[PDB]
């Protein structure tokens, strides 16, 4: 390490890490920025926070750190602690946890022409406003915004990195380091350099580099574990129309219990969606629709039971019985005491028969009402389910990363 | 004082706090370790971690920090910042949160002969393997292992710190005047033992805490409701089949037990080397209520047997109408012209119909009496099974006691 020690001593004599590498004032230091996503750790939708493992590559050139390799035994690279060199204070502006800087302050790699290469790792928790309108068949547009916390445009030039003639306008993904998230698939990964032209040229954070991640959820877990259970348990509600309209038929028990089950499912769904109010989730609207359908099922079960268990002595309605029969076809001296008692017996049996006939008419009326309302509620349930699920199905990610920009922002090859 | 300043300047002239105080090569630094428990903060069984607040008591000798009090205006003791003197690298080896060091940097008391006494505070989270078998009637043996991280036995040798009573005191000190007992745990034993390595670790000082849980919370909140629900499950067999409420009672008792298990899951440990006795009791009760549901379905099936379709086997008649009722005390109450021609025919038909209805009713009553005998037999069987199982589990729990000796 004689040559490395000699070079470090020579370079660090008189070097101020707190002063910019501007040989002449009014010079601007070009800082190239590249991002390598190693693992998309999570997207916490409740906190609206994207946790990502990244390597943030920062390149610049310090004129003070130049040397001739021939004077140092052919040494062509030096690992220096990043605290002893000047750095551009590049920070993630849209962090949520207050952590602005990188995690590990690893070494920089200085080259003989003075060009410094820093590539620290970081676990960044950025702010991602989550759109919930198509949950769980949704895609999210998260951003990582990088800017200098100290220096303005007149002091540094924050540009995207350039390969051999090509600008790397995308988040890099090395196959030797990337791990795929089991819930989120990265569809588009562009990068942009944003400089508000009319902004002050003296304030620090106005030139930014924004790395966008368009990520699509993999909804297999939510369909298998949440949606299909809800659909089937709601279909159980439809079965009460076939149960008899008498004691022991147990219509209301079934209907209210499936209502409780659907409320439990609403509780489960509410845990996994933010408390924002820009829109109602798709699954939440479907759950509310199912709840209303079950409530109307309860209402009609009560009405049908009331009509069926109506006593003949209570009241009768000639118009009501007529209308169901219309719809039924499309749907498809001791002798004196002896004779007195015999007449009383016969008249009592006649009254019993008339009462039974009235009860039977009411029972048929209730059955017809239940049958006509069955088809209407089945149509309502099927139509609502189909419409909501098609609305889910047609929420595709946009073809291009930016609307109005014909470019794809993908690597050449 | 100026005398103190001059003394401190003299002592720390050419003094290296990173160099162990060994006057000769091969010399050992003897360190005495004691512990004072200020508060047993908690024992989290889910994380399997014991949180405590303690005051260490570390004592050793630094030959470089000795002086003559007569030459320094009678100063015989100093309170020096702990970062200005060499410290033993004593750490809690079995910590759970990754924190090894003490909570606060305080003064070391240095005597004129070079004796160093350091009593730092420490909020520690040590690992404890929870024996879950008798939870919540359990006692835990939670250890705090203190050892030098770097220095080996040939460099720094540990020993147990003696209280002012001397006699090589081997115990965690607790000041009974100020110590506030934990509301969930009672300290039964609190020894301290110097574990020396075989012939690769180094010497350590382990402070053990045998702590017995106080199970009143779980008795009130879990055990007694379970006993009540089980007693309710017994009485489904005394309910008539005609009420039409056996299924509701038994099933909703099962639902209540499931609710209790799920809302108790937030308190029990989550290891898999054993099953808690309370979880065993809950599983036993759930299985018993499930069997109660099954046999209630059987009784309801027997009660509603249509006489005209189901003919009673003669063996059923002998066992369940003649033999068992005597043993169960369920004695049956019963010890066992043209117009005139047509009227006569009609009246004969009425009499025959009422005879047929009477025979049907007799068979139906026999079936219902069989169902009733079966119901009473199941009532007694469930009373026996419930009482025996509950007694066995409760005696197994109650006879689990903390040890009388810290180290069998």
């Amino acid at each position: 390490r004689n040559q490395e020690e000699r070079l470090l001593g020579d370079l660090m004599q008189g070097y101020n890490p707190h002063l910019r590498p501007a040989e002449h004032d009014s010079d601007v230091v070009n800082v190239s920025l590249k991002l390598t996503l190693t693992n998309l750790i999570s997207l916490n939708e409740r906190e609206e926070a994207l946790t990502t493992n990244v390597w943030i590559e920062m390149q610049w050139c310090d004129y003070r750190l130049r040397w001739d390799p021939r004077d140092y035994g052919g040494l062509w690279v030096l690992r220096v602690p990043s605290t002893m060199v000047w750095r551009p204070d590049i920070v993630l502006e849209n962090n949520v946890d207050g952590v602005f800087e990188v995690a590990l302050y690893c070494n920089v790699l200085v080259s003989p022409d003075g060009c410094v290469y820093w590539l620290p790792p970081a676990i960044f928790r950025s702010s991602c406003p989550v759109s919930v309108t198509f949950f769980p068949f949704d895609w999210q547009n998260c951003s990582l915004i990088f800017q200098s916390q100290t220096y303005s445009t007149n002091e540094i030039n924050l540009q995207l990195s350039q390969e051999d003639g090509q600008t790397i306008e995308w988040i890099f993904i090395d196959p030797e380091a990337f791990t795929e998230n089991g819930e989120w698939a990265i569809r588009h990964r562009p990068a942009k350099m944003l400089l508000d032209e009319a902004a002050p040229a003296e304030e620090a954070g106005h030139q930014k580099v924004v790395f966008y991640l368009l990520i699509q959820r993999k909804p297999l877990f939510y369909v298998i574990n949440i949606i299909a259970p809800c659909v089937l348990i709601s279909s159980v509600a439809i079965l009460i129309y076939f149960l008899p309209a008498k004691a022991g038929g147990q219509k209301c028990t079934v209907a209210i219990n499936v209502l409780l089950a659907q409320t439990v499912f609403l509780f489960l769904v509410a845990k996994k969606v933010p408390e924002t109010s820009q829109a109602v989730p798709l699954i939440s609207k479907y759950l509310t629709f199912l709840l209303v359908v079950t409530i109307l099922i309860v209402v009609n079960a009560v009405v049908v039971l009331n009509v069926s268990l109506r006593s003949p002595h209570t009241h009768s309605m000639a118009r009501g019985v007529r209308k169901v029969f219309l719809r039924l076809l499309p749907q498809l001296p001791a002798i004196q005491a002896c004779v007195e008692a015999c007449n009383l017996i016969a008249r009592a049996r006649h009254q019993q028969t008339h009462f039974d006939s009235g009860n039977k008419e009411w029972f048929l009326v209730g059955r017809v009402l239940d049958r006509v309302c069955f088809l209407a509620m089945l149509s309502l349930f099927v139509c609502g389910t189909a419409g909501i699920f098609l609305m889910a199905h047609y929420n595709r990610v946009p073809a291009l990363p930016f609307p109005g920009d014909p470019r794809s922002y993908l690597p050449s090859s | 004082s100026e005398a103190e300043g001059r003394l401190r300047e003299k002592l720390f002239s050419g003094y290296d706090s990173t160099v162990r105080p060994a006057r000769e090569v091969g010399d050992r630094v003897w360190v005495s370790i004691g512990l004072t428990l200020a508060q047993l903060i908690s024992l989290n069984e889910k994380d399997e971690e014991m949180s405590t607040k303690v005051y260490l008591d570390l004592e050793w000798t630094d030959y470089r920090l000795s002086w003559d009090p007569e030459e320094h205006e009678g100063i015989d003791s100093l309170r020096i910042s702990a970062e200005s003197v060499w410290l033993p690298d004593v750490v809690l080896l079995n910590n759970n949160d990754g924190n090894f060091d003490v909570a606060l940097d305080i003064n070391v008391v240095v005597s004129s002969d070079g004796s160093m006494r350091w009593q730092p505070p420490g909020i520690y989270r040590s690992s404890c393997s929870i024996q879950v078998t008798y939870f919540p009637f359990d006692w835990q043996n939670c250890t705090m292992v203190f050892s030098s991280y770097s220095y080996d036995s040939s460099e720094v040798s540990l020993q147990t710190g003696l209280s002012p009573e001397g006699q090589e005191r081997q115990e965690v000190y607790i000041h009974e005047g100020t110590f506030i007992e934990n509301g969930q745990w009672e300290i039964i034993h609190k020894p301290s033992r110097l574990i020396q390595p075989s012939v690769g670790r180094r010497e350590e000082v382990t402070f053990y805490l045998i702590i017995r849980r106080k199970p009143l919370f779980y008795l009130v909140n879990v055990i007694a409701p379970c006993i009540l629900i089980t007693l309710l499950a017994i009485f489904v067999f005394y309910l008539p089949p005609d009420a039409g409420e056996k299924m509701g009672l038994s099933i909703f008792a099962l639902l209540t037990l499931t609710v209790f298990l799920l809302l108790l899951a937030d308190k029990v440990p989550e290891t898999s080397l054993s099953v808690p006795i309370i979880i065993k009791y809950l599983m036993f009760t759930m299985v018993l209520v499930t069997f109660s549901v099954i046999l209630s379905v059987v009784v309801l099936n027997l009660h509603h047997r249509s006489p005209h379709t189901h003919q009673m086997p003669l063996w059923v008649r002998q066992i369940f109408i003649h033999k068992l009722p005597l043993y169960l005390g369920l004695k049956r109450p019963k010890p066992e012209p043209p117009e005139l021609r047509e009227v006569v025919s009609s009246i004969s038909y009425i009499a025959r119909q009422l005879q047929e209805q009477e025979d049907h009713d007799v068979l139906k009553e026999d079936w219902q009496f069989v169902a009733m005998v079966v119901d009473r037999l199941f009532l007694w069987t469930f009373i026996i099974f419930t009482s025996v199982g509950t007694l066995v589990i409760f005696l197994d729990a109650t006879y689990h006691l903390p040890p009388a000796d810290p180290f069998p």
Binding site: - | Q39, G74, L104, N221, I347
Partner: protein, 427 residues
């Protein structure tokens, strides 16, 4: 130049201040005056048994090394310095349970020409407060903030309370200061007593730093309107519906189902209430005692409903209605609680006789059924009049134990002093 710059150069460079040395002779003790200003009682977590408080801790002493003549420095009469530039008594909260002994923000010290050092750092302290659950939600708690020096013993420093002056008479501030310009009231806890004491333990040795301490106590009373409205009233109203099963008939009315549903509601209440309090074994909560008593009562009422349904659905073909039971449960208790004519006609007369006998047997069967039903109703009314008084009395007793609980008139039992500002003890 600045007289501040000249004064700092005089005190710290010319005189060579050493912050590691106490401002006293070797065998002399420094007097530290301590006061506490409560800015906000952030929370009292019962499950964790932790009091989080926002407090300004006022420390004062005299450093004769940091004195100057104001005339020699442009009549400068105060100087702000970093706390790390001067010797500090290093007062810490001994009662912390999170491990944060020190103040939060190490602000500047103010030094005056007389040599008096005045420090008022703020802090957010999380102290251990053991909780009494016996009267929850009508409970009061007694938390304490104990302050002491772990770096110095009673030989080296002397803790004492701040002294204030009124009309030239000096008194000690024996209470937590409540600045109206910097205090915010807690919506759940009201402060009843806020004393302050200097404790010296004669049991521990003189060379122990734990011998002396200054303790600031907060006796606080919970405001129970939230729990009364949201928890107690629903649970009590649900519990008292168990009386309604006794009015339900034994055929249509689902007595057992309603009663066990009340039991399920009580179980849900109990299990969700157990999570709002610690799992200590010192006592059972008041609400917990009420819910256990109610659950036992509901279990008894369900057993009673089972027995009543058993009695109601009895028949002549299974049970014999004894005359003692009949008289007891239908007369005694209800009163206090409130030749062709031979041969061709033999078929006719035989059929008529059989039909008549069948009707008589059916009538007797029905009357026996009705008698059993009335016996069951009498049992139901008796059980109502036996159970409802017991439940009302138990509920009233438990909640009157709850309501009549109040803090002691004095902060410390056995000490007549009120520790109030109006009763300042001049000395």
């Amino acid at each position: 130049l600045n007289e501040e710059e000249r004064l700092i150069r005089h005190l710290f460079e010319e005189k060579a201040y050493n912050k590691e040395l106490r401002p006293a002779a070797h065998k002399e003790s420094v007097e530290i005056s301590l006061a506490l200003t409560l800015s906000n009682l952030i929370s009292l977590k019962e499950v964790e048994e932790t009091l989080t408080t926002n407090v300004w801790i006022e420390q004062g002493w005299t450093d004769s090394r940091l004195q100057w003549d104001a005339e020699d420095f442009g009549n400068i009469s105060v100087l702000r310095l970093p706390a790390d530039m001067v010797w500090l008594p290093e007062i810490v909260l001994e009662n912390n349970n999170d491990g944060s002994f020190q103040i939060s923000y190490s602000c500047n010290v103010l030094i005056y020409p007389s040599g008096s050092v005045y420090w008022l750092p703020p802090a957010i302290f999380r102290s251990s407060c053991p909780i009494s659950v016996t009267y929850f939600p009508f409970d009061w708690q007694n938390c304490s903030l104990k302050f002491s020096s772990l770096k110095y013993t009673t030989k080296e420093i002397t803790l004492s309370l701040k002294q204030a002056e009124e009309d030239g008479r000096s008194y000690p501030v024996e209470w937590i200061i409540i600045d109206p310009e910097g205090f915010t009231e807690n919506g759940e806890w009201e402060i009843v007593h806020r004393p302050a004491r200097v404790n010296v333990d004669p049991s521990v040795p003189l060379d122990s730093p734990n011998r002396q301490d200054v303790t600031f106590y907060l006796i606080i009373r919970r405001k129970p309107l939230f729990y009364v409205i949201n928890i107690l009233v629903p649970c009590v109203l649900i519990s008292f519906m168990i009386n309604l099963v006794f009015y339900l008939p034994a055929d249509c009315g689902e007595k057992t189902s309603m009663a066990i549903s009340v039991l399920l509601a009580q179980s849900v209440f109990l299990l969700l209430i157990s999570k709002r309090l610690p799992a200590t074994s010192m006592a059972i909560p008041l609400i917990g005692k009420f819910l256990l008593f109610g659950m036992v009562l509901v279990t008894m009422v369900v057993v009673i409903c089972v027995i009543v349904l058993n009695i109601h659905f009895r028949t002549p073909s299974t049970h014999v209605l004894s005359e003692p039971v009949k008289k007891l449960f239908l007369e005694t208790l209800p009163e206090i609680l409130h030749q062709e004519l031979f041969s061709e006609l033999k078929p006719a007369v035989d059929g008529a006789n059989f039909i008549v006998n069948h009707m008589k047997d059916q009538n007797n069967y029905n009357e026996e059924k009705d008698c059993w039903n009335r016996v069951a109703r009498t049992v139901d009314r008796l059980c109502l009049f036996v159970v409802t008084p017991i439940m009302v009395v138990g509920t009233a007793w438990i909640f009157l134990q709850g309501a009549y609980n109040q803090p002691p008139p004095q902060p410390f039992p056995g000490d007549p002093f009120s520790y109030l500002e109006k009763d300042k003890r001049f000395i």
